[PDB]
Write a protein that binds this ligand. Structure first.
Ligand SMILES: [Zn+2]
Ligand SMILES: [Zn+2]
Ligand SMILES: [Zn+2]
Ligand SMILES: [Zn+2]
Lengths: 83, 534, 119, 180, 99, 39, 516, 87, 35
């Protein structure tokens, strides 16, 4: 019922259809709250479109904590996922 | 005080009375027991919140010693033993009645006058039950080595062998229904297979054997032949010193019952016969019919062929008991004249109140099975005549002998003006002394085409006001400890010296007002206790 | 908001200056830019206790604490008498009780020159 | 000048993501805990250190980073018998308004441990003495016995949150220039 | 308010609430049923949990245990007229963090 | 009736953009939007 | 203050229901409504003395002020009022459940109709950890079957038959189940009283087999209040709460709802206000209860008041559920939570929403799929909140100086310190353009690139809604690309569809990647 | 899945799921409310159709997981400033 | 606010003011006891 290290990792390594709506969903709100982005932008607007460009280089500074249904953790850094 | 006056039964009395003079940690545990009935300690823990598992057991053993609860054990066949815990109805009455135990000892024991244990025999009653259970060796080991201990030790055989100091055991300490359980199947397994005929009569074999034993098991504490030690040296009569004993309320409740009857005597006869009636009753106080009647408490009270048998034999006990049927020749010496004790007792047979009513010529005895319902019918009516108008006393008695009266004949039987009774009768609808019977003239209970009949309904009419006094017993002592919550900075100082001039007055004004409480608690205690004669 | 424990340990009044001296460092040239709210309170602490100390190294502070706490167990008040009226013995008489009937030795003269040597 | 092991969670605005974590969690806790009183503890001054810090969580409606942490800070609790030399700024006819100048001024300390000639004389004096007078803006020595903490707001000045008790029972009390 | 001359505003219906839920979406469903339409600010108590006004509990008159949230106006108004008959929606509250 | 910064007394109901708001001519701070009509 | 204030954001783990007590009503109410009449003849604008549209209970208009909390309509969350009934009545919601609570218990001594060694077996089946609602009421079916099959009680030996409805809304108990042995101590007393009244007015013998003792709402409260708390859990209700006693399930006090629930609508055909249905139901019960309370004090006929006490029993059971009229029907509480879009479909499941629009559709091939075309006259109404950042500061300054008459402009802005809004058609714009603090939010119009939802209104399946990009054209109608028409099953014959636009940023991202 | 085949009627929905805000959102409304508080029931809000009207973050779909920020720190600078406690 | 008291509202007599002594010292016995 606690953190689960890299060895006993028993779920999918795959960045599912509902992840890229949430991670991109929560990143653009950070951009709109003046959090600095890392990527080489040119002249852009529209804090969503600057997010989904920056996803392509996989430089999101986040990590997803999936729950097992028994109330147990399972963690995956957003660079370790593949699409 | 609307928070409390609404959603509180007798539990509002039981919770605060152990909160009055005992630790607060135990007031909440028996509040859980009375609310939820019966439960073990293992799952007691999650019902309350904030008391640890061992901390319950320390709190429960603190409450065990005063005999305020009653445990009972049953085991599972594949499992271990489990111990349930109930609530004791009469053990918590002891610290309720604790002031009045003191004043009866002096009044029952008038053989001594200006004794040097006037302080001490009132302390001994406070020394037998305040610590809980008590034995002989525990008070001779005090600071007094002798100080005439042989007088004080032999003082108690005069005080115990008259009764109400019975050796404690498990019998009265375990509940009666569960006591009635495990003796029922034992006699049911005394009769095995191959007695085939009348299987619905074979249940009576254990059932008749239960009643013979259940009287004998309750007589084992009443058996006084095993609490004596006739010591051949230095003594003549003494109790067994290895005996644990406490108070027994059974004589006290009967003694309080005899205290109630003499007040009814002084109302219906003058001063000369009231002194006569008190003397003969004191001789038979120590052995009387039981007031609680544990046989009618639980059992097969369902069917009328046995429910009538709980008073057929119980009446036959009363007149055919050798220990009370007095011959009216003993009474002339006990007063501090065979013609006068006939003459003053002659009018006890004449009056329609059935005390000393029926007898064999030459012997006399007072009945109880046909008396105390007239006592219950006596204290009920005059209280209504006190709390509202005496016209309401008139309407109550009109419905007594005349059953189910309508609104025309009340003007024919009684006679007052027509507009004033409705401003009095409706007050008696609100307190459930009179009831409504409806007769439909048309279909579907149409309210206009109907007249409305009445009834006394003798059983609901007491049970309303008994809880109207149990809450009233519970309401005024809430203002006792709440009064102690304010002015608390100086009672801690007044418990520390063992002296500011202006502060001493506000210690007196909080003193005579609580002095009024215990007097006002005692007066309605007598108006309540008559409703326990069930 | 949970307070786990209140009185874990003590902290000497030198670090009330010392740790706050480093807080006076990285605060954009305090006290000398005359030619938020947290600044004004945190300068009112550092000046008040320093004037009492005036009107130094931490090593020489440390060994005079070792000589002082010669008590059996009731020592803990050695932490509070560090800067409270130095060079005064009638001051020290009213601080700790029951020492006028216990310190009748050459200790209470030896403790005076340590406190005045601190001054 | 004592430490208190306390735990609380603290928010982080997203524009402080560029600055490092320890200074950011210090900054947002400073103006929360600068010049504040603590219920039933005392007066917190400044965060001392950071013991252990967990992983940063996110509320989905807000989108910022919210973090919980355990840390102790400095808090001024002398003793119930502490000798101290404060100053004064006010004089009243039933007691004396002695409070430390510089930090806080919500203090009323009585005189219930002194002699039998103590009252008020409205001639810029305390009373007439049976002896050098004392006045504003000078070191005045007084001790501490108790404190009172209440945190109740009866919604419908004498701020009662942090008030000390003081007395002047021995000699030399009232002015530090009577000794030394 | 319904009606073009009543200056309109569209009814997002009940099977349209069924149409979104199959997409697995869990954020724009909340804003379009609380935030864009019917947002309302409620301060509610912790112990004996029913609503209170600006700064009280008005059933335990202590005004201490107050925790601010936000709920739709159609959820507040259920929690009052359902309290008008003798059933009580007692609220109980947990915090989000330290799962 | 009185604005919050310039304390103007005249409020003009603009009705062109289906908002039906309340705002003064002086500075441009709205008083109360989302009008409550009694149906 | 110099004091710390700290709170964590919180959540709701789950609701638990309860009937609030007969003492908590005055605890949470603060006014009282003893009097009757709604509008005083003072000829004031808001004439309300005590028991009416009370100005310190609430306010049902825009020009008045709530004298309790404060404020006119933006702030007042309403306050409850309480009443005081003359003598109790039944609850119509619990009326099904107020007879299950009586069939288990004795009609004389008020004990449950069980033996001791039997009742201890049952509540064992309550104490095991695995119990859901489906079997918890399953064993409550067996506990009332066992009791009514058992004729006589356990403490006073009294007879106990059956009790049911009287098909009004009163219940009667038949205590008469003789088999072939009429020699009962119940029966002999019943005839023993009855021939006493047959001496006079002897026309009443044809009624006797019909006539039967009743249980009015006064003695049932006195019958419920007698009982002990120990047997409570065996028939459904539990202890350890203040309201857990079973006397609170019939009315003795009733609360008055805050006046925002019953708004005083003015129909504006006359300067008198046509008040809704719900006030005059509560108004007429305080008149009946007042004249009953005066009725027993001066003295009125018992054959008169028993139908006045039948009246408000019938009347208060209409304030909750108006189906019990036993017949222009009055709307009640139960008449608007359920039904054809009263609640739970028309206001709570499916709501009505801001920022929508509705025009008819016409085809267009020349634009791509995912691209819906939006006309410009609707495109400068539907705005979108958008914060200021250094990434887009240089755009918003040029956009805010356009103003809301040319196309690429804004309508409202929020600076950080201000609290309401700023109108852009009024005041100076270019000076307001120059400051633009970086933490602020403006409301630009719809422009080509934002996110628009779009669906047919009769929505067959999950795929009847999907989201598109927008691009603005100077005509008047909605245009879409033709290949997407087959899900919408459009037919261009005069049908119209609506469009939506989200107003966060995290919904702007989720609408594309899941509904594009 | 609950031992016996049962319909999707009122009589059927009363035997599958017992969460009284969802059942009141079904056809007969008040007859599931009064008897709920009469037995003093207790339901957590975990189904979808009661997370709508309370207005919380939904349990399912893309509302299953949570979003956690990296804190870019380790124990290498998490030692206290311990110095000169009592001597 | 409520009328009609019980009939027992009287000045305490010397018959029972000594009986009222026995209550308060009984509570001082047990509460200052072990429990
Ligand atoms: Zn509350
Ligand atoms: Zn203005
Ligand atoms: Zn108000
Ligand atoms: Zn019975």
């Amino acid at each position: 019922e606690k953190a689960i290290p890299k060895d006993q990792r028993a779920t999918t390594p795959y960045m599912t259809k509902y992840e890229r709506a949430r991670i991109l969903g929560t990143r653009a709100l950070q951009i709109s709250m003046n959090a600095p982005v890392f990527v080489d932008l040119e002249g852009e607007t529209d804090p969503l479109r600057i997010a989904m460009k920056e996803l392509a280089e996989k430089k999101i500074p986040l990590v997803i904590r999936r729950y097992l249904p028994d109330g147990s953790f399972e963690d995956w850094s957003v660079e370790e996922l593949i699409v | 005080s609307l928070e409390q006056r609404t959603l509180n039964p007798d539990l509002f009395l039981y919770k605060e009375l152990v909160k009055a003079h005992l630790g607060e940690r135990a007031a909440s545990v028996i509040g859980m027991l009375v609310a939820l009935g019966r439960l073990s300690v293992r799952e007691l823990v999650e019902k309350i919140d904030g008391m640890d598992v061992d901390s319950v057991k320390t709190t429960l053993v603190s409450l065990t010693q005063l005999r305020c609860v009653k445990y009972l054990q049953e085991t599972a066949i594949s499992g271990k033993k489990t111990t349930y815990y109930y609530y004791n109805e009469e053990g918590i009455h002891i610290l309720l009645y604790s002031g009045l135990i003191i004043d009866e000892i002096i009044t029952q024991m008038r053989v001594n006058d200006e004794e040097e244990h006037k302080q001490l025999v009132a302390e001994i009653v406070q020394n037998v039950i305040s610590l809980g259970s008590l034995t002989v060796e525990d008070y001779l080991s005090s600071v007094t080595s002798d100080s005439m201990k042989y007088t004080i030790s032999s003082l108690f055989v005069q005080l115990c062998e008259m009764g109400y100091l019975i050796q404690i055991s498990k019998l009265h300490y375990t509940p009666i229904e569960d006591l009635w359980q495990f003796l029922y199947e034992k006699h049911y397994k005394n009769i095995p297979r191959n007695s085939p005929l009348s299987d619905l009569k074979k249940r009576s074999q254990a059932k008749m054997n239960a009643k013979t034993d259940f009287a004998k098991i309750i007589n084992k504490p009443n058996e006084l032949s095993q609490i004596l030690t006739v010591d051949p040296k230095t003594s003549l009569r003494i109790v067994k010193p290895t005996v644990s004993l406490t108070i027994n309320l059974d004589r006290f409740m009967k003694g309080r019952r005899s205290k109630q009857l003499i007040n009814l005597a002084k109302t219906r006869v003058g001063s000369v016969t009231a002194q006569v009636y008190k003397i003969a009753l004191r001789l038979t106080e120590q052995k009387s019919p039981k007031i609680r009647d544990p046989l009618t408490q639980t059992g097969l009270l369902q069917d009328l062929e046995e429910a009538k048998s709980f008073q057929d034999e119980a009446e036959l006990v009363e007149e055919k008991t050798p220990g009370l049927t007095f011959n009216a020749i003993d009474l002339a010496r006990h007063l501090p004249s065979a013609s006068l004790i006939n003459s003053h007792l002659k009018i006890l047979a004449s009056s329609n109140f059935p005390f000393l009513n029926e007898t064999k010529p030459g012997v006399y005895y007072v009945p109880y099975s046909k008396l105390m319902p007239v006592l219950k019918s006596s204290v009920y009516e005059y209280v209504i005549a006190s709390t509202l108008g005496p016209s309401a006393m008139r309407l109550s008695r009109c419905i007594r002998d005349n059953k189910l009266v309508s609104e025309k004949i009340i003007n024919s039987t009684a006679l007052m003006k027509e507009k004033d009774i409705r401003s009095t009768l409706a007050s008696l609808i609100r307190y459930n002394s009179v009831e409504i019977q409806e007769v439909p003239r048309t279909a579907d209970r149409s309210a206009s085409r109907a007249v409305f009949l009445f009834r006394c309904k003798e059983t609901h009419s007491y049970n309303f006001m008994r809880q109207n006094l149990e809450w009233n017993m519970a309401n005024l002592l809430f203002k006792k400890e709440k009064l102690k919550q304010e002015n608390s900075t100086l009672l801690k100082k007044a418990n520390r010296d063992d002296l500011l001039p202006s502060e001493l007055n506000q210690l007196k004004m909080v003193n005579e007002r609580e002095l009024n409480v215990f007097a006002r608690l005692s007066r309605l205690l007598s108006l309540w206790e008559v409703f326990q004669m069930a | 908001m949970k307070v786990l424990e209140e009185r874990n340990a003590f902290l000497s009044d030198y670090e009330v200056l010392k740790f706050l001296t480093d807080l006076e460092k990285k605060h954009l040239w305090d006290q000398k830019s005359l030619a938020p709210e947290l600044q004004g309170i945190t300068r009112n602490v550092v000046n008040y206790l320093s004037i009492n100390k005036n009107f130094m190294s931490d090593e020489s502070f440390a060994e005079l604490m070792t000589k002082l706490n010669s008590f059996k167990l009731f020592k803990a008040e050695k932490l509070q008498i560090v800067n409270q009226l130095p060079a005064n013995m009638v001051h020290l008489y009213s601080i700790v009780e029951e020492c006028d009937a216990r310190f009748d030795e050459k200790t209470i003269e030896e403790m005076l020159e340590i406190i005045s040597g601190y001054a | 000048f004592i430490l208190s092991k306390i735990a609380d969670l603290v928010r982080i605005p997203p524009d402080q993501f560029h600055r490092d974590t320890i200074s950011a969690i210090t900054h947002q806790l400073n103006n929360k805990f600068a010049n504040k009183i603590i219920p039933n503890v005392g007066l917190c001054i400044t965060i001392y250190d950071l013991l252990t810090v967990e992983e940063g969580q996110l509320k989905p409606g807000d989108g910022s980073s919210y973090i919980n942490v355990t840390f102790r800070a400095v808090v001024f609790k002398p003793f119930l018998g502490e000798i101290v030399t404060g100053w004064i700024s006010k004089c009243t006819a039933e007691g004396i308004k002695v409070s430390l100048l510089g930090i806080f001024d919500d203090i009323f300390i009585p005189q219930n441990m002194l002699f039998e000639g103590c009252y008020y004389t409205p001639e810029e004096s305390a009373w007439i003495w049976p002896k050098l007078y004392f006045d504003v803006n000078e070191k005045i020595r007084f001790r501490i016995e108790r404190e009172v903490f209440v945190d109740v707001k009866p919604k419908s000045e004498k701020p009662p949150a942090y008030a000390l008790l003081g007395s002047c029972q021995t000699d030399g009390m009232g002015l530090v220039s009577w000794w030394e | 308010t319904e009606g073009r001359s009543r200056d309109g505003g569209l009814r997002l219906g009940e099977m349209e609430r069924d149409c979104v839920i199959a997409y697995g979406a869990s954020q724009l469903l909340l804003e379009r049923l609380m935030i864009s339409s019917d947002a309302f600010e409620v301060d509610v108590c912790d112990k004996c949990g029913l609503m209170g006004y600006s700064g009280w509990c008005t059933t335990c008159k202590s005004a201490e245990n107050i925790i601010k949230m936000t709920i739709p106006y159609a959820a507040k108004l259920l929690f009052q007229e359902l309290l008008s008959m003798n059933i009580a929606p007692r609220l109980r509250l947990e915090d989000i963090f330290q799962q | 009736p009185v604005c919050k910064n310039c304390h103007g007394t005249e409020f003009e109901r603009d009705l062109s953009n289906a908002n039906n708001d309340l705002v003064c001519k002086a500075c441009g701070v709205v008083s109360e939007d989302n009008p409550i009509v009694s149906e | 203050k110099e004091v710390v204030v700290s709170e964590t954001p919180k959540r709701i783990k789950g609701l638990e229901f309860s009937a609030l007590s007969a003492a908590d009503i005055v605890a949470q109410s603060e006014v009282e409504v003893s009097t009757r009449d709604l509008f005083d003849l003072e000829k004031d604008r808001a004439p309300k003395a005590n028991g009416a549209l009370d100005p310190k209970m609430g306010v049902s208009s825009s020009s008045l002020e709530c004298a309790t909390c404060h404020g006119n309509l933006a702030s007042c969350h309403g306050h409850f009022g309480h009443l005081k009934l003359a003598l109790p009545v039944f609850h119509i919601g619990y009326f099904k459940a107020t007879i299950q609570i009586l069939q288990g218990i004795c009609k004389n001594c008020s004990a449950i109709l069980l033996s001791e060694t039997d009742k201890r077996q049952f509540l064992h089946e309550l104490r095991r950890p695995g119990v859901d609602n489906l079997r918890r009421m399953g064993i409550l079916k067996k506990i009332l079957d066992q009791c009514k099959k058992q004729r006589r009680c356990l403490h006073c030996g009294a007879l106990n038959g059956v009790v049911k409805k009287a098909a009004a809304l009163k219940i009667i108990h038949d205590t008469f189940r003789w088999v072939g042995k009429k020699s009962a101590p119940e029966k002999d007393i019943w005839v023993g009283e009855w021939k006493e009244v047959l001496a006079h007015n002897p026309e009443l013998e044809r009624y006797v087999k019909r006539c039967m003792d009743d249980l009015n709402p006064l003695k049932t409260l006195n019958l419920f209040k007698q009982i002990k708390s120990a047997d409570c859990e065996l028939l459904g209700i539990d202890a350890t709460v203040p309201s857990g006693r079973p006397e609170t399930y019939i009315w003795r006090y009733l609360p008055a709802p805050p006046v925002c629930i019953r708004p005083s609508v003015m129909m504006q055909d006359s300067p008198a206000s046509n008040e809704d249905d719900l006030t005059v139901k509560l108004t007429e019960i305080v008149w009946t209860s007042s004249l009953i309370k005066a009725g027993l004090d001066k003295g009125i006929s018992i054959n008169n008041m028993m139908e006045h006490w039948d009246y408000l029993q019938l009347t208060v059971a209409m304030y909750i559920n108006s189906d019990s009229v036993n017949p222009k029907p009055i709307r009640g509480f139960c008449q608007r939570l359920k039904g054809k879009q009263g609640r739970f479909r028309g206001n709570l499941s499916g709501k009505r929403v801001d920022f929508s629009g509705r025009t008819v559709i016409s085809p267009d091939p020349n634009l791509s799929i995912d691209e819906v075309a939006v006309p410009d006259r609707v495109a400068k109404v539907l705005t979108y909140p958008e914060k200021v950042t250094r990434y887009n500061r240089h755009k918003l300054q040029e956009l805010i100086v356009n103003g809301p008459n040319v196309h690429p402009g804004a309508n409202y802005l929020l600076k950080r310190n201000e609290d309401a809004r700023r109108n852009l058609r009024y005041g100076d714009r270019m000076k307001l353009a120059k400051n633009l603090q970086i933490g602020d939010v403006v409301e630009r119009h719809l422009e080509d690139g934002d996110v628009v939802l779009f669906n047919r209104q009769p929505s067959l399946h999950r795929l009847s809604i999907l989201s598109h990009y927008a691009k603005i054209r100077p005509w008047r109608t909605f245009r879409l690309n033709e290949c997407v028409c087959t899900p919408y099953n459009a037919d261009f014959d005069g049908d119209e569809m609506n469009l939506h636009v989200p107003q966060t940023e995290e919904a702007r991202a989720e609408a594309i990647n899941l509904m594009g | 899945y609950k031992g016996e085949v049962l319909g999707i009627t009122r009589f059927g929905l009363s035997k599958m799921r017992d969460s009284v805000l969802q059942l009141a959102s079904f056809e007969k409304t008040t007859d599931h409310l009064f008897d709920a508080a009469f037995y003093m029931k207790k339901d957590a809000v975990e189904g979808v159709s009661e997370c709508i009207i309370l207005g919380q973050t939904m349990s399912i779909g893309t509302g299953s997981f949570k979003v956690v920020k990296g804190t870019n720190i380790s124990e290498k600078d998490l030692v206290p400033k311990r110095c000169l406690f009592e001597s | 606010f409520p009328s009609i008291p019980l009939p027992i509202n009287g000045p305490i007599t010397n018959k029972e003011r000594s009986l009222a002594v026995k209550y308060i010292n009984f509570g001082k016995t047990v509460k200052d006891g072990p429990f």
